[PDB]
Structures are given as structure tokens and as C-alpha cells.
Amino acid sequence: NAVTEEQLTFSQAMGDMLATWQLPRTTGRTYGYLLLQSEATSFQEIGADLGLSPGAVSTSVRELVAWGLARTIPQPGSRRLLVEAAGGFEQLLAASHERSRAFIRTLRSGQALADDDRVATRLVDLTDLFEAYVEAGEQMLR
Amino acid sequence: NAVTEEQLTFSQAMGDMLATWQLPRTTGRTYGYLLLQSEATSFQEIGADLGLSPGAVSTSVRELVAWGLARTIPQPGSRRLLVEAAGGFEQLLAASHERSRAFIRTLRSGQALADDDRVATRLVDLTDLFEAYVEAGEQMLRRRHEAGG
Numbered sequence: 001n002a003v004t005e006e007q008l009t010f011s012q013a014m015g016d017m018l019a020t021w022q023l024p025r026t027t028g029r030t031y032g033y034l035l036l037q038s039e040a041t042s043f044q045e046i047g048a049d050l051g052l053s054p055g056a057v058s059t060s061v062r063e064l065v066a067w068g069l070a071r072t073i074p075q076p077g078s079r080r081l082l083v084e085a086a087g088g089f090e091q092l093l094a095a096s097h098e099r100s101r102a103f104i105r106t107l108r109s110g111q112a113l114a115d116d117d118r119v120a121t122r123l124v125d126l127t128d129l130f131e132a133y134v135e136a137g138e139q140m141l142r
Numbered sequence: 143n144a145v146t147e148e149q150l151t152f153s154q155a156m157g158d159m160l161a162t163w164q165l166p167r168t169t170g171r172t173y174g175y176l177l178l179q180s181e182a183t184s185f186q187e188i189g190a191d192l193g194l195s196p197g198a199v200s201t202s203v204r205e206l207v208a209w210g211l212a213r214t215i216p217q218p219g220s221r222r223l224l225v226e227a228a229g230g231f232e233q234l235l236a237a238s239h240e241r242s243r244a245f246i247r248t249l250r251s252g253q254a255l256a257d258d259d260r261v262a263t264r265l266v267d268l269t270d271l272f273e274a275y276v277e278a279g280e281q282m283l284r285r286r287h288e289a290g291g
Contacts, residue, residue, distance in 0.1 A: 006255050013248045020241075035265060038258050088268050093275060099162070106155045113148050116180040123177060126230050129286065133235060136282035140275040 007036045021092045030060035031069050040073050040082035067091050100134040149178050163234040172202040173211050182215050182224035209233050242276040
């Protein structure tokens with residue numbers, strides 16, 4: 001029905017969003033699904049509700065747990081796991097911050113290679129703005 | 143020699159860096175090259191120094207100029223253009239901010255679709271933090287200009 005379609009399209013959009021951090025689209029789709037579930041769900045349920053193969057569900061859940069976006073829960077009397085959304089974007093955003101720190105080092109390397117005052121100053125000004133931008137969000141993670 | 147190799151590798155790294163903000167790698171490479179040039183350079187020099195086709199150079203320059211990362215300079219007595227690094231990252235970062243704003247609308251849509259309090263609370267906490275993170279960078283850029291920076 002209409003609500004199922006809205007939840008599935010939200011899942012699809014979350015796949016595209018988490019791909020900005022190089023997570024496979026199926027992993028973000030699984031996350032978007034979990035976000036709208038009120039109770040923990042089995043791997044079988046995730047697969048049935050998203051039309052995913054068991055290997056795809058297993059891989060996605062493992063990635064989400066590794067990134068602090070989900071938690072797996074054992075079940076009495078079975079090896080089957082339940083899954084729920086958990087944590088948040090802190091770990092993904094910290095990883096993005098670290099990539100930006102490597103970018104800052106590349107920019108500072110260019111500053112050092114500059115063999116002309118005009119070239120050096122241009123790179124200093126470019127780098128200072130980017131550093132200010134990068135560390136604005138770092139205060140949010142703080 | 144050592145300095146030319148270091149300049150080329152800086153150019154290569156800048157291509158990889160700006161691909162984060164969806165700038166094609168050859169375009170980011172051209173930008174990193176221009177950043178270390180003390181004088182405006184011709185299309186022929188860019189292509190020779192970077193091993194790029196005339197079409198690749200022309201496309202890259204047009205994209206950098208569109209993004210406010212380079213300026214083209216006419217030459218007396220010719221139709222050939224010179225190119226120099228210009229402006230800065232402001233436009234690329236603003237474009238990134240706009241993509242994040244669309245993500246926030248998606249998250250707020252899921253929040254609205256939430257059909258019980260536990261789900262809604264999880265989504266509003268997740269989205270509140272991401273939106274605060276996004277708007278910190280935007281406020282930073284806006285404030286940098288009002289202050290005289």
C-alpha cells in the first residue's frame with residue numbers, strides 16, 4: 001500500500017545517501033529499512049521486505065554493525081540473529097573528517113612546494129578556508 | 143626532476159581530492175597543476191605538462207572556470223587564451239552543502255513517516271545531529287565573510 005511504498009522509497013533514498021560515504025547502495029537501503037522498523041527484525045524479514053538475497057542481507061548487516069549503524073541481537077534457542085538500527089552517523093562522519101585531514105595535508109604539501117610568494121599565499125588562503133570548514137563540523141562531533 | 147615530479151603528484155592528488163565534491167579527476171588534476179604555476183599558462187602548456195589531449199584541456203578549463211577555480215585571460219593579437227588558478231573552494235563546498243540539504247529532507251521525510259514514538263525519536267535524534275554538523279560548515283563560510291576574512 002501507500003505507506004509500504006513510502007517506506008521502501010525512503011530505503012532507496014538512504015541507499016543513495018550512504019553511497020556518499022562509499023557504502024554499497026544495498027547497505028544504505030538496509031539501513032533505511034531498519035530505521036522505520038519499531039522492533040528488531042530477522043535476516044529473513046529484511047530479505048523478504050526488501051527483496052534481497054540472504055548473502056546481500058548478511059553482507060549489509062555486517063557493514064552496518066561495523067559502522068555503528070546497527071546492532072545484532074541473539075535469540076533464545078536459535079543461531080538466528082535479530083537486527084535493529086542503532087548508534088548514528090558519528091563513525092561515518094569521523095571517517096569523512098579523517099579523509100579531509102588527509103586533504104589538508106595534501107594542500108599543506110602544495111604550500112611547501114610553492115617556489116613563489118604569490119603561489120604560496122594563494123595556497124595558504126585556499127587551505128585556511130578549507131581547514132575552517134572542516135573543523136566547524138568536527139566541533140559537532142565533539 | 144624532483145620538483146617537477148612533486149608538482150605532478152600534487153596535481154594527481156588534487157584530482158583525487160576534488161572527486162569528493164564530484165569534480166572529474168582530470169579537471170581536479172588541471173586545477174592542482176594551475177595552483178603551482180606562478181604565471182598564467184596556455185592550453186598547449188597544460189596539455190603538454192599533464193599529458194592531456196587538447197579536448198581534455200578545453201573541457202577541464204571550462205569546468206574550472208564554471209566552478210570559480212580558474213580564470214581565462216585573452217591575449218593581445220590572438221584568440222588563444224591563458225589560464226590561471228582563481229577564486230577558491232567556496233562554490234564546490236556550497237554545492238556540497240546543497241546535496242546535504244537534500245539528504246536532510248530525506249531524513250525528515252522518514253521522520254514524518256515514523257508511525258510510533260520510538261521510531262520518530264530515533265530519526266529526529268539522528269537527523270538533528272547530521273543537520274547540526276552540516277550547518278556548522280555553512281555558518282563557518284557565512285561568518286568568515288561578514289567578519290572580513
